[model samples]
Target: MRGKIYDRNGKVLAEDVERYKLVAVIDKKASANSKKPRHVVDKKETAKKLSTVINMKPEEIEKRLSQKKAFQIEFGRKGTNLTYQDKLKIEKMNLPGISLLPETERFYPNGNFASHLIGRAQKNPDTGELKGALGVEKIFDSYLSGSKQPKRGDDVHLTIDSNIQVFVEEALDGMVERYQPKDLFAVVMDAKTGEILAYSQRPTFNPETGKDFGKKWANDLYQNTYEPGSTFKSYGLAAAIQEGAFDPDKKYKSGHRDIMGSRISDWNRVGWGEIPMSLGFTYSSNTLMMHLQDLVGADKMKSWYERFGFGKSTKGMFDGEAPGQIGWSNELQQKTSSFGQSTTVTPVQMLQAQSAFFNDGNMLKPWFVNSVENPVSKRQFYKGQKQIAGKPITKDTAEKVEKQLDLVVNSKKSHAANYRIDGYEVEGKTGTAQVAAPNGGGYVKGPNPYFVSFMGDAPKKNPKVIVYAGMSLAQKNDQEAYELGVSKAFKPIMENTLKYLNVGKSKDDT
Candidate 1:
């Protein structure tokens, strides 16, 4: 039997369930007694009965019986993977030589819950063996459906707690239903260890039906990459602070900056005049990031990008991950990437990078597979632990960045206002980036055509969880504001995540 997949709490995620297949012994010599015959006595009548019972046609069942070269015959796809109800109906017909052979197929109890992460395994009809197709199922296929000595495959236990996983699914659902976005993904991670506690994404399909499997198959967080908008500003600001290039009190001209051929402007168009980098960041001014690029050269920016593990293979999230590109030059992409424009990045990489901010500047590799254990022996085949990905910034710099994030979320001047939770000092960044034209004509030209997002961590100091939620509007001309439902979705997810982690209110709470 293919072994089960479970969550950190021993809750089953993916498993093997027994399904019966209808088979008939057609050889006359196989019958022990005439009355209680094991071989098909009346091919025409029996085939007709099976035709009514199963999905197969009468002629087809009889044709298999007519061709007696083999001792027995089994209906192809129609009679395969018989449900318990179908098996019972065929049994009630009292057909001789009819037998139900038990077959096992992979089953996911939670249909669309973290589907892309847990993935799907389907039974190959011809071989009657379950094969992994995607996600963890695909990555550890050999271990799951092995040709090894232990016989029964080992179980995979993931870092995700199903209890916490559900919370993010519910929040992402609310986000989708309310926002009507084309693409969406959300995740909650342990700020200290970089263990992903929960994850869910849009365009997900049920592994059982697999109807929309290929059509909506991508694991957006790990497989796809896009401009991260202002959520990326935190990393740029973090790098600037780490290098002593960024000062909270330092001022820069707001509006537009002429960088050779291209002119980059703020989201507010005209600008906020000359403003401190702190207040400018609080407002998510794009020009502020460009100005920081002036202090820290493009070389330093790319260096920090590598330190944060961007454009690098993700350590333990999964296999076949897309390490998004980083192309920097003296050209526009160089200046634009400072504000998360030129270089594309995957969301999982974004989470891994953000962990450095909360983890005392030591970026921790994020992982999902918590452990792999042999059920009979109870010995661990593998176990995941917190490993430092990189020390991009110092502890002091990380602390400084947290306070800056705190001010950004707490201030009423930005879309981050909705991210504030009662009795908790929530620190996060807000974003609404225009989607680049698919054909490269330019950014999509329409109202509310953007990817809006929010990434936050709770309780301010010694944060327990980091939550990231992002969405792209389904309709470019969407009447609602571009950043409409993102922060609303993030607020409850973070609030519940903190409460579930047993993080109490701030020390300042009365």
Candidate 2:
């Protein structure tokens, strides 16, 4: 047996293996010269002994053993059925010799923790060998799998602060339950280091069995593409401001616009009626974004999207992650992409690009697997911060963009009502996209709902956690739920997160 593996504070997280009994059969009678049967027992006496070793009642064990033919036994079906971890506990007992097969097991004390962000591990179908199958497990498999030196050479330490991870998980749990989401995904990352603190997805599964693996690809955050709605306006506004072509204080009419043969209108088609740039962003004016896209020109707009990491793979170590399809190719595509209609991006990529606001124009790679330490050799592998993947704007441009983003949230009448953090400036944008059918074509009218999100380090100075959240095919009623209305569900999560992280609230504030 090996020694125990502990977390940073020395709490035992995992340790060496051990065997336990399973399904012990008892034989009652034997002849003078005959060999002893596999099982020998006086039913009542055997039951008494077995009861001491397992949770099953003596009467129950006795009755099962009395069944004439080779008896079979199983444990509590309901409780164990909830999770593989729970099932294993029962399987280890009540069935001596039948269980307890020698194998390496990985355990996380916190259940349903960072299920999506950490991904999962799986056994090779053909080779029967265990491996990190996806997420951080797959991404950092090389380090975790270790060098050729020995089977048990070193230990791996992750930069993930378990305490903060717990906070993120708990926050999402309440959000999912409240929204009745078909699925929800959220990630928490350190602003300075690019270290992922927590990642969770609703309707999760145990990593051991991978029972829910089939649905992994169905997650829209990683798989589906949709028009990002008004959230794309932030980028358009940012680009224009950075280019010194637009003024926040200048006024513009907000209404329908003819662009690339299509008429585009604001959320309700009510029109803000000549609002300033600041109010335009606060109102998420569709007309403004379209008009600006016309000014930036399609080529430059596409370049900004590409530079922001749209239509590209997140370049995460995990395999099977699709770089979202950036739809449309012509001038019309550019026009629509500017407003987040024809363009698409994975949640990770969106979060990465959004990092530009608070990271001083540099976008860091979002990652888990804080570090790996060789338990024996004491050598460690630590993840480091990366520079901007590509520049969409300069530091000054990003700062100006963040200023408007802050105003969008701070102004009481703005949509930021959905994202208040009580004591601090909480800046974010909501995205509701129409989902296309599985067979292809344009977005379906009802039932399918796609929501994407990006937010982080508010106030634009001395930042901490940045988070990205999303939901695909949200449970919906028969009517069409447009972007503005459907995005209401995500607001509380962002606000509560501020309280959870203690970002702005002080001892006196509470």
Candidate 3:
């Protein structure tokens, strides 16, 4: 009795549907040796007739039929997990010894859409009850799991914008084929309301077929913790501004910063002589970030991180949301944490933290469920709203950092300059993090396997949407290519969403 689940726009994304599996009751005892032969009259004949329908080979069906000792046999792969079409086919043929076992599958009309978010359902043979397997389906299990005494299960509605989800998927699809990166994903949200508008990840499987699935059951946003790289510098800048340590005209030397016995360098890998703090962000200078961290002090910097809700789980709403850790005990650890490394965060945590920029310094905990209601009585059982997760920075500090983020994106020579969209001003930073060593001693050694990511809000002020996208590649070559790959996909979701949401170009125009 699981009920319908929908997107924020009230479009169907998931629901229950009828399905079956073909089985052959091979027990001659089922017929008690009757001449009518209720059980598989002729194995060859049935195999030949059913071959056209299930796409299973005749020889294959014969083997399943050959289980003479077994009381009953069922076909797998080709024969099992049939749709209503196959059910009708078997009913029309009226074949002997052949029968379909009924099963209920959570049908996603949009096949490959948001499988990780909506999760999947399969009927348990023991109780013949459909059980939740992951995601929203798993989180609100009892709410969706209904009794048939008299009523249906309550319905679930999500904050996802189906239209925006379509655009995100199209773009993600384009990138997976174009780059074939190790991993890729994108998410869009209402920064003010903390409602997720859309979310998509590559290496996703079609819920219907469940092909190419297992590897990425956990969505990167909430489950996988990764280094944020320079993209985190924007957040760091807010701390710097909040502490009154960031002076626009204060020129700082670049290149490498000596953190105790270790060396942390910039993307340029060479000194930039002297430049202002604002340009430091545009150039993505690691040296400058470490310098500012020293001024902000370790305790204060750690306080800033805590304020943003880092090192904490948003909630285990999905399978398991990872609470990324911050490294700050050692002074060197403190310096490395400055630029967006020596620290780990899930993409969802990062998104939650980013929501602050547009929310006047108050961080909004990102959420998916909009509400739940009794199917018949229409009584509301649950509802979701914008929860203020934290007040990390002052409004003046948020405004201050917002302008610098704009400078980083708009500067002609800025690495993030390419993120600019027509009429709409895009403000955000790009990050390139080294994949941590699997064995945990240190970073993986090679040609520097890295993950490139970007997070941004649109239209400069009073932004309508926040989009976060990232990819980790086996081949980390052509740093610009990775950045280009992410941004090319990221910009479209931003542009199209603005147009779709009817967000006018000018604040006054709206």
Residue-wise lDDT of candidate 3 within 1-510, one digit each (tens)?
A: 687788887788878777798878777787875767678877898888888888878998888898757977877667766888878987787788788888767778888887778877766777768777777777777787785354578788999888888899999887766677777889998978888889988777777676766777777778878887777887788899888888888998888877677777887688686898888877778888888888888888898887888899987356678898998878887787787888899888888788888888888888889988877888878988888888888788888788877887887767776788876878887887777776757886555467778888887767888888888763534455555747878888898898888776655234
The digit string of per-residue lDDT tens for model 1 on 269-362 reads 8998988888888888888888887788788888988888888878665766888877585568877787777688888888888888777788
- Cα TM-score per model: 0.87, 0.80, 0.91
lDDT of 2 by residue, 109-183 (tens): 554555554555554435334455655555555655533223663344444556655665676666555455666
Which pairs clash in model 1? none
Residue pairs with colliding backbones in model 3 are 221-348
Off-target runs (Cα >4 Å) in candidate 2 are 1-21, 25-38, 44-104, 122-129, 138-150, 208-213, 217-227, 447-456, 459-462, 476-510
Q: Rank the candidates by TM-score, best first.
A: 3, 1, 2
Every model's Cα RMSD, please? 4.0, 5.2, 3.0
Q: Give the CA lDDT, 0 to 100, for residue 232 in model 3.
A: 81
Model 1 residue runs over 4 Å out of place are 23-33, 36-98, 439-442, 476-481, 506-510
- For residue 170, model 1's alpha carbon misses the true position, in angstroms, by 2.1
Model 1 scores worst on lDDT over the 10 consecutive residues at: 476-485
Give the Å error, residue 354, model 2. Answer: 1.1
Q: What lDDT would each prediction earn against the true structure?
A: 0.81, 0.59, 0.80
